[PDB]
Amino acid sequence: QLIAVDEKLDITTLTGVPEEHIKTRKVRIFVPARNNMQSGVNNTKKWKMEFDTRERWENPLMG
Amino acid sequence: GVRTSPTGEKVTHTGQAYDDGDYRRVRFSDRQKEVNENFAIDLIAEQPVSEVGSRVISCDGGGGALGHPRVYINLDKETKTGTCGYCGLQFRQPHH
Amino acid sequence: TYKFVNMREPSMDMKSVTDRAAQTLLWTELVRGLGMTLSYLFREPATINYPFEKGPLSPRFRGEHALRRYPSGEERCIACKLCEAVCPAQAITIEAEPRADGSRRTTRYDIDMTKCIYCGFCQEACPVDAIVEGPNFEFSTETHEELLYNKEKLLNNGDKWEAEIAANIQADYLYR
Amino acid sequence: ELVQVLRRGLQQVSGHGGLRGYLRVLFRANDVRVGTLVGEDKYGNKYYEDNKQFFGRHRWVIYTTEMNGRDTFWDVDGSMVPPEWHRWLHCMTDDPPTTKPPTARKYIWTNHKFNVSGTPQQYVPYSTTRKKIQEWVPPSTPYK
Amino acid sequence: SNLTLNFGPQHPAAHGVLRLVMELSGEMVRKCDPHIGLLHRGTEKLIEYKTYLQALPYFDRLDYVSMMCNEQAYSLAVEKLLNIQPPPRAQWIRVLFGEITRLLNHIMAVTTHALDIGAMTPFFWMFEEREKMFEFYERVSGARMHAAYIRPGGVHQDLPLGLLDDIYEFSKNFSFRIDELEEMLTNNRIWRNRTVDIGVVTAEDALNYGFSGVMLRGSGIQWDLRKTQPYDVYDQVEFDVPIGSRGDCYDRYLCRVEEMRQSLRIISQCLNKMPPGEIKVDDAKVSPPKRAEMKTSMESLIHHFKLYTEGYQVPPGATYTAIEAPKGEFGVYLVSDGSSRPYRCKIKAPGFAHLAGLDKMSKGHMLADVVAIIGTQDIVFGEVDR
Amino acid sequence: SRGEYVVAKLDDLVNWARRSSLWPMTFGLACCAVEMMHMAAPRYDMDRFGVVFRASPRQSDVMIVAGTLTNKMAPALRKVYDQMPEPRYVVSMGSCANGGGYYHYSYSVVRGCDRIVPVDIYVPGCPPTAEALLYGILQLQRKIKREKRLRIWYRR
Amino acid sequence: LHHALIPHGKGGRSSVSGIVATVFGATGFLGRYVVNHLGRMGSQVIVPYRCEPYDTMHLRPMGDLGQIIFMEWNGKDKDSIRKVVEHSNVVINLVGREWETKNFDFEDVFVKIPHAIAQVSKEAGVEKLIHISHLNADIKSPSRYLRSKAVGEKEVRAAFPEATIIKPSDIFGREDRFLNYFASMRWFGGVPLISLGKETVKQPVYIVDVSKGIINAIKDPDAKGKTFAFVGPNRYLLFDLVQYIFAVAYRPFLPYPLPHFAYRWVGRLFEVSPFEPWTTRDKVERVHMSDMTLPHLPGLEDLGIQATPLELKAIEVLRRHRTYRWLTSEMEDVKPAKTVNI
Amino acid sequence: TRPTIRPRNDVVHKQLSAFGQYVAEILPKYVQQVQVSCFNELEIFIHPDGVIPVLTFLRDHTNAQFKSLADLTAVDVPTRQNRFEIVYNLLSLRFNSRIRVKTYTDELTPIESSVTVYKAANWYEREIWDMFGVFFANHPDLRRILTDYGFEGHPFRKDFPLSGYVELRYDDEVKRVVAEPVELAQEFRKFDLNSPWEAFPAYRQPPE
Amino acid sequence: GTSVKPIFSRDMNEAKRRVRELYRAWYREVPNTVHLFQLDISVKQGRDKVREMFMKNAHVTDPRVVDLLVIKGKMELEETINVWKQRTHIMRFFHETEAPRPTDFLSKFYVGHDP
Numbered sequence A: 001q002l003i004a005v006d007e008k009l010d011i012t013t014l015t016g017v018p019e020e021h022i023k024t025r026k027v028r029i030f031v032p033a034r035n036n037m038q039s040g041v042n043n044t045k046k047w048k049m050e051f052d053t054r055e056r057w058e059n060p061l062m063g
Numbered sequence B: 001g002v003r004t005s006p007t008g009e010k011v012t013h014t015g016q017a018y019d020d021g022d023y024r025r026v027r028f029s030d031r032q033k034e035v036n037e038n039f040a041i042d043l044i045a046e047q048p049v050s051e052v053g054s055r056v057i058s059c060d061g062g063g064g065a066l067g068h069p070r071v072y073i074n075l076d077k078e079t080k081t082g083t084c085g086y087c088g089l090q091f092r093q094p095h096h
Numbered sequence C: 001t002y003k004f005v006n007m008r009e010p011s012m013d014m015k016s017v018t019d020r021a022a023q024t025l026l027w028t029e030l031v032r033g034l035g036m037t038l039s040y041l042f043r044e045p046a047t048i049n050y051p052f053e054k055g056p057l058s059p060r061f062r063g064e065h066a067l068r069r070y071p072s073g074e075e076r077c078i079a080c081k082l083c084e085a086v087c088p089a090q091a092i093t094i095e096a097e098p099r100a101d102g103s104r105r106t107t108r109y110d111i112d113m114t115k116c117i118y119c120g121f122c123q124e125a126c127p128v129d130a131i132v133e134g135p136n137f138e139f140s141t142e143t144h145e146e147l148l149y150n151k152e153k154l155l156n157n158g159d160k161w162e163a164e165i166a167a168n169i170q171a172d173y174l175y176r
Numbered sequence D: 001e002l003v004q005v006l007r008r009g010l011q012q013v014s015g016h017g018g019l020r021g022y023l024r025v026l027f028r029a030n031d032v033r034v035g036t037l038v039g040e041d042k043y044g045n046k047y048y049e050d051n052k053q054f055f056g057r058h059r060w061v062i063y064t065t066e067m068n069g070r071d072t073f074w075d076v077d078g079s080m081v082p083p084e085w086h087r088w089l090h091c092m093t094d095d096p097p098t099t100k101p102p103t104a105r106k107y108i109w110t111n112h113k114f115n116v117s118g119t120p121q122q123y124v125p126y127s128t129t130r131k132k133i134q135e136w137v138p139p140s141t142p143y144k
Numbered sequence E: 001s002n003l004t005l006n007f008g009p010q011h012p013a014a015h016g017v018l019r020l021v022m023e024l025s026g027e028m029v030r031k032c033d034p035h036i037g038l039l040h041r042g043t044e045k046l047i048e049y050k051t052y053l054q055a056l057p058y059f060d061r062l063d064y065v066s067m068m069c070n071e072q073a074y075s076l077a078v079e080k081l082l083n084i085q086p087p088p089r090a091q092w093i094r095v096l097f098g099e100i101t102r103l104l105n106h107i108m109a110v111t112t113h114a115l116d117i118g119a120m121t122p123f124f125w126m127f128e129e130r131e132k133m134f135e136f137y138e139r140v141s142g143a144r145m146h147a148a149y150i151r152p153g154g155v156h157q158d159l160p161l162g163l164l165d166d167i168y169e170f171s172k173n174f175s176f177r178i179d180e181l182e183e184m185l186t187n188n189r190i191w192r193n194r195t196v197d198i199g200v201v202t203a204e205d206a207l208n209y210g211f212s213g214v215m216l217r218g219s220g221i222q223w224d225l226r227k228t229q230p231y232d233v234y235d236q237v238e239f240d241v242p243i244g245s246r247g248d249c250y251d252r253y254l255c256r257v258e259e260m261r262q263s264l265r266i267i268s269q270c271l272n273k274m275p276p277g278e279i280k281v282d283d284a285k286v287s288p289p290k291r292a293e294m295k296t297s298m299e300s301l302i303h304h305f306k307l308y309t310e311g312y313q314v315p316p317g318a319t320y321t322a323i324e325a326p327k328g329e330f331g332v333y334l335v336s337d338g339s340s341r342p343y344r345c346k347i348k349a350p351g352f353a354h355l356a357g358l359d360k361m362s363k364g365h366m367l368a369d370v371v372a373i374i375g376t377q378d379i380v381f382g383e384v385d386r
Numbered sequence F: 001s002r003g004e005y006v007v008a009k010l011d012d013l014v015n016w017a018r019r020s021s022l023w024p025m026t027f028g029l030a031c032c033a034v035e036m037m038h039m040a041a042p043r044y045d046m047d048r049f050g051v052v053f054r055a056s057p058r059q060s061d062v063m064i065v066a067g068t069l070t071n072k073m074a075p076a077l078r079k080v081y082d083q084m085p086e087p088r089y090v091v092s093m094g095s096c097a098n099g100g101g102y103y104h105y106s107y108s109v110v111r112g113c114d115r116i117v118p119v120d121i122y123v124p125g126c127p128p129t130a131e132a133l134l135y136g137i138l139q140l141q142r143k144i145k146r147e148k149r150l151r152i153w154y155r156r
Numbered sequence G: 001l002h003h004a005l006i007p008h009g010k011g012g013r014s015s016v017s018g019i020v021a022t023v024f025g026a027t028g029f030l031g032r033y034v035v036n037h038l039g040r041m042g043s044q045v046i047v048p049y050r051c052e053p054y055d056t057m058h059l060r061p062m063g064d065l066g067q068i069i070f071m072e073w074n075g076k077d078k079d080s081i082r083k084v085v086e087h088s089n090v091v092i093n094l095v096g097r098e099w100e101t102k103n104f105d106f107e108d109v110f111v112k113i114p115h116a117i118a119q120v121s122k123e124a125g126v127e128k129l130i131h132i133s134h135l136n137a138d139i140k141s142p143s144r145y146l147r148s149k150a151v152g153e154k155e156v157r158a159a160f161p162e163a164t165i166i167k168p169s170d171i172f173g174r175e176d177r178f179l180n181y182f183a184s185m186r187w188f189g190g191v192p193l194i195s196l197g198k199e200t201v202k203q204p205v206y207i208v209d210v211s212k213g214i215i216n217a218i219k220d221p222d223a224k225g226k227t228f229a230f231v232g233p234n235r236y237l238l239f240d241l242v243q244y245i246f247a248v249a250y251r252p253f254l255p256y257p258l259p260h261f262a263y264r265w266v267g268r269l270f271e272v273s274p275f276e277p278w279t280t281r282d283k284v285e286r287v288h289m290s291d292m293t294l295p296h297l298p299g300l301e302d303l304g305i306q307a308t309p310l311e312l313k314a315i316e317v318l319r320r321h322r323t324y325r326w327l328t329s330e331m332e333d334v335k336p337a338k339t340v341n342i
Numbered sequence H: 001t002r003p004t005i006r007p008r009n010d011v012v013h014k015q016l017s018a019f020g021q022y023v024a025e026i027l028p029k030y031v032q033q034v035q036v037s038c039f040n041e042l043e044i045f046i047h048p049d050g051v052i053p054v055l056t057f058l059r060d061h062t063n064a065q066f067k068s069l070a071d072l073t074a075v076d077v078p079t080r081q082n083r084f085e086i087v088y089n090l091l092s093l094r095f096n097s098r099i100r101v102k103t104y105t106d107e108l109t110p111i112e113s114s115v116t117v118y119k120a121a122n123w124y125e126r127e128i129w130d131m132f133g134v135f136f137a138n139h140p141d142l143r144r145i146l147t148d149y150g151f152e153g154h155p156f157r158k159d160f161p162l163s164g165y166v167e168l169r170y171d172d173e174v175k176r177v178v179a180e181p182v183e184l185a186q187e188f189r190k191f192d193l194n195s196p197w198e199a200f201p202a203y204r205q206p207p208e
Numbered sequence I: 001g002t003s004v005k006p007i008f009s010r011d012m013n014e015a016k017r018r019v020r021e022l023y024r025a026w027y028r029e030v031p032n033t034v035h036l037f038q039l040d041i042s043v044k045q046g047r048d049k050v051r052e053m054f055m056k057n058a059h060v061t062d063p064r065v066v067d068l069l070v071i072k073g074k075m076e077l078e079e080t081i082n083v084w085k086q087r088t089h090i091m092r093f094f095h096e097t098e099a100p101r102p103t104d105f106l107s108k109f110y111v112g113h114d115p
């Protein structure tokens, strides 16, 4: 038998992601732009979801 | 073609050398810095320019299949030699 | 087509029962095993006298990496980054720029030998036989940092092992 | 037959340069076999062959007692073999560098070096690239 | 209250990374609970980030006792998805080295089982033959175990000019080594007492519990993938399938010894019937061209570039490809989405199902019996844990 | 001096006894242990160097980390290392134990066993050959020969 | 700030903290904790060592690749000091011994070596210097240890005027000589105490608190030329403290009074050991001396450190000294000791 | 077309199509689709409520006799409302055949455990729960099998990062192994390998 | 009816009762965990940690999510009781080694770029 949950879907507590990477993250949903160097359009069919760029630094060893 | 930095550190062929105030030199204390002594730019500069009697020459780096992909060099400019894009060897037509 | 491995029953002859009883009481199979061990004791051992003797190898052997040169002394590498793209372990890091003479040459060529799986895909991908897997295998270090190779170390390895690398390549490039 | 193997042992003792040489090779290499001298190294290593031993014991090297800077009477290791004899000794080829010398190049090391780990000559990694971002330099003159 | 014991991971009989939680009444084993994942490396997720060529060495490292067989299974799956066919000489080379790999794995399994039970001597006798086969591997590829020789279009390189003779020399002598092993173990009453009627599994329980390979054939089930669903050239070689009668450790030991003999037979047949020709598919959009062509031909250079940077694309689809690996049925469920990277790769290893049934086989047995049962299942945890 | 000569001789004797009797723990994780098994095989015969495997960590002098170290296994490796009586040594065998190797970016793999235990010798390869591991073991012996415990104690 | 030293990352193992620290005496009790804290944030740590390199193995897993560099040094050689402090912006001095060897006395490890370190660091361009003294250091104490401590403290201040001086008191931890010292005298039947330990007051401090205070003083701009006292939150009588120590270890406590001269004589007898002495006359003097109270000095709470009471950390040190019967006993079962607080 | 192209087998294709029609006819209540691939593999897509019936049929019917469970696994497709896809691979020794049964579920809907039909499923289902978080109802012992103790999250999900969230190291202050937020000396270098040109015209999708 | 089937509970009341059962089991287990694992924490500290872990998911309103959370908590307790976990796993709940990340704007601005 069915129980008729009428709430908003929220699986946040089940994914095991740290709360820092849930509340302070901003995602971008977009169709990627065509690479202007080529005329092919096969990479502009699907939607992509990506995350905001964070800090990258240089390793003290090997750089 | 190694040269010495003002701090006394050997300079690599890429030109890298830590400055005087750089703490990262401490990794070379009680040890050494690895610098390759044979500089490819200086070594390729010693090769004589090859005189050929054709407008277009071919280069594969020598050794046949043991070299690089075969390419064709135009030699129509008289003020500059033709350089291989893989090997660095220089070719020219008889001038003067 | 199949065969049975353990579907044999033994004869019930009086003499056969006697042999089985003698085997049970006098341990003939165990004597046979002792005889096998004794025969092995008098054979010549297979041990080799390392390090004065070495195990056999092949020209195809994959070991410590090296960067090679043309006979003129110019580096073979042209920074196409095919080895970097093919590396299954992402163990290669490459940075390049136009050289002072305009040649297309690397400024950084790093191989993390603690990431490398020694598959040899890099030397198969390389179009100019620049990066190779050498014949050396005795290069254990005392620290982790010594196994993070940069371009200077790899060029030194090439200069050190070229006399053997070139000869190994000569014997196998017709299979490639 | 037993007297023949005893004679062979006595011949092994005699052929190493007397009792002193026999003891030296016995305590250094843990082996007293005698083979034909294939060649002598630039650094003092000697390379011997004997085709009657089985595959793996038919080629060997007696290492030098004095490599680049260290005393290798007791402390020897496989990294002391130069690359040409490295190819011969590991059975990658049947041709010794004495009969089939390698090609000469101006950039090839004229002096082989062993594994220098744990010594002041060890390799230390570093970034070979130049600085990416250049910072603004304030003027040396006062502004007011 | 029963005694609770940690068996492994640091235990000689634990095969490295097994944590067997055992509940014992005295020395009787009341319950076995295998904790695994101590060698879980997340191989499938990593494969999802590589191209099809880049994912091949993972299959080498899966079952590190049977390397060419894992390569062959992955290659067969990718070839089925690509709708290409390897050349005949490549198929004969694949079957030859698969039989050599079967010999290597069976040596390892039998000798380690004997060492666990207590017979320490045949291990040293047979690991010299293992060393010679490692030499064959290294001569053909340059690596003693992790060859990556078998590729999804054929094989990487051709055999060196003197390899077949050396393989024949090894094979004409390996039978006496098997004979010495059997003299050591087959009729020994201590060995039989340790193995007879130990870990007995019925045919129906073996089928339901997902068993395969020897674990099936020891119970009398007449099944073998090389006979029922042959893949490379196995329909052109004649060999016999050993069948057990009692379903215990002794029958499985006998089956493995006879399978070594049959692998020798197949190796002889492959040596005689090796054909000439090319070694990889003559399709430069899948297999790389030769180095001489790449340095002379524009198309060859372009295809070399694109194959070693992006890789070939595989048409969208999903396949399940299984082979008779030396440890059982080794399978790959491979899902492609039209790209040059696999969408999903699920690895089916016989060790997973065989270890999931260790508790069933160990009922009413002692600690040493459980050691024997672990030995008889031929478990390598690289494939169990993935 | 006279005391320094005596402590030097005692140092030599102790180092020789320690390096000539190296007992590794019977400990292996993955593919590399197989090559380790080939070092005990008749061709190389590590026994002839004074090297024998012993199961109990209390009766071991060296630990060889031969294989991948996962996050699940790391506490067990640390535990069996801590129960080793001193002096003790660690040899890292292969890329996975060295720095993670082919699984360096995995979620469940420790990026190098030197994050868990201190390491004396790093043997590179995937897997290192039995000759490479033999070279590493002899290098560890040469390192043990170089240690000066009583000389340093006498100069305190 | 020399761009190569600009902090980067989230303060983890692979981050850059901007600290290049030469830690003298890093192979000691406090040195391991200091190096651990420095390597946690991703600092370049330079370890000068004079012992056998084996005795430094435990310091190797404490930093990322290349972040811990071990160099040999000699205490009496200033060239070695210059070599090890040339490229550092912080120098920490943790050199010290609780006994005098035939090569180094109390004024060699507490006056000469600290002064040489401070002078070479000042002339090598080092920006920050951290020097560890004792809380009870003064030039008129019966203990030569503390007199040398005070002389060396003032000499270090003279050589490096903007140095940070930290004066802890009886650090307790897993590898200490405070709790372990009192727990180990159970093997002598009774516990000898001067005047039954009823006229001595101790204020021990947690080792982690001291290491955190040192790390915080490194990155505190205002702590350039100040002097800190690192003491615990509670002051105990010596008798009560030892009784609590034996109660946590679950050992029978049989104290007895011993006159000062007899205890000094047993200390002199134990001093003859060519190895590390079990106890010395100086150790006896320091054990039975009350802790000074210096309220005018800044403390741990001025560096943001809340001192951890002994009650929450005594079990982690004293559980090793229990027998199998009492090995699993919990922490709150031992009835915390009486405190002489104000 | 002979040398480099994999040959076809129409007989097996016809047999598999006939048996797929047979199975669809016998079980109309649960069977939603039947397919045969170009390399002769039979696939049956069923409603999630038919896991126990269909499998039982395929194991016990005289004409099916799919006695062996070769493999059971899940596939994560985030773009679908029912995120997870459950795949059963079965082998019939009597008829020398292989079949595949596929169903679907999401993060909150349990799937009925098939341990009663196949014992081999017991671990596989556990693995699915460990790697994807799909709950199996009426499982005799459902717990983590592959991941570390106390591991949070399900790694085989597509939104789970490759290197995870935490990493392990030994800490000497606490004298034990500790977990910290993950930090990488070298970040994994993502490669954009897809070509901007179509490869297979036969699989082109309508342009909406 | 939204066409959703339950795991165990049909409404929030049954889910709450299951939560209370799991909480009781954890509260009873805490002293045994402290004794067996030889932890240097008090029973009160462990019980407060259990309370914090339970309150971290106090905002859930879906009975299915509460059911899955209770199932995961039951597996965690079963891991703890059978000594499958080690002291390291149990002490990972406390983050003793991790340096506390400041939460106010100025400290975040001083240390770096992360919000």
Ligand SMILES: CCCCCCCCCCCCCCCCC[C@@H](O)O[C@H](CO[C@H](O)CCCCCCCCCCCCCCC)COP(=O)(O)OCC[N+](C)(C)C
Pocket: D027, D028, D029, D030, D074, D075, D076, F009, F010, F012, F013, F016, F145
């Ligand atoms: C009295 C009870 C306590 C002491 C017990 C002593 C028992 C007898 C002593 C044992 C004698 C053996 C020691 C010397 C053997 C070394 C052999 C030689 O080859 O060593 C070389 C170097 O010599 C050693 O360094 C010297 C070790 C001992 C130095 C002097 C001995 C001092 C003995 C004094 C004992 C008195 C104590 C009294 C206590 C009351 C280097 O060899 P090495 O290369 O590595 O190994 C071979 C590998 N190969 C193949 C590459 C060659």
Ligand SMILES: NC(=O)C1=CN([C@@H]2O[C@H](COP(=O)(O)OP(=O)(O)OC[C@H]3O[C@@H](n4cnc5c(N)ncnc54)[C@H](OP(=O)(O)O)[C@@H]3O)[C@@H](O)[C@H]2O)C=CC1
Pocket: G024, G025, G026, G027, G028, G029, G030, G031, G049, G050, G051, G075, G093, G094, G095, G096, G097, G098, G104, G109, G132, G133, G134, G135, G167, G168, G169, G170, G171, G172, G177, G178
């Ligand atoms: N522990 C305590 O109760 C408190 C400590 N004190 C002070 O705190 C400092 C560190 O304390 P702690 O860690 O416990 O002391 P330790 O005895 O544990 O370690 C002393 C360190 O100093 C080095 N060292 C000692 N003597 C010399 C020397 N002659 N030459 C070179 N190095 C030497 C040691 O190196 P090596 O291992 O090679 O000998 C060692 O690394 C010390 O200066 C001490 O005086 C302050 C109040 C009390």
Ligand code: SF4
Pocket: C083, C086, C087, C088, C089, C090, C091, C092, C111, C115, C116, C117, C118, C119, C120, C121, C122, C123, C133
């Ligand atoms: S051998 Fe393989 S893993 Fe190593 S650098 Fe080359 S491609 Fe990468």
Ligand code: SF4
Pocket: C076, C077, C078, C079, C080, C081, C082, C083, C084, C094, C122, C125, C126, C127, C128, C129, C130, C131
């Ligand atoms: S080594 Fe070869 S493949 Fe790699 S960048 Fe250089 S030329 Fe290209």
Ligand code: SF4
Pocket: E061, E064, F030, F031, F032, F033, F066, F067, F068, F093, F094, F095, F096, F097, F101, F102, F125, F126, F127, F128
């Ligand atoms: S280094 Fe290679 S062979 Fe060794 S355990 Fe890791 S993957 Fe296996």
Ligand SMILES: [Zn+2]
Pocket: B059, B060, B061, B068, B084, B085, B086, B087, B088, B089
């Ligand atoms: Zn050219």
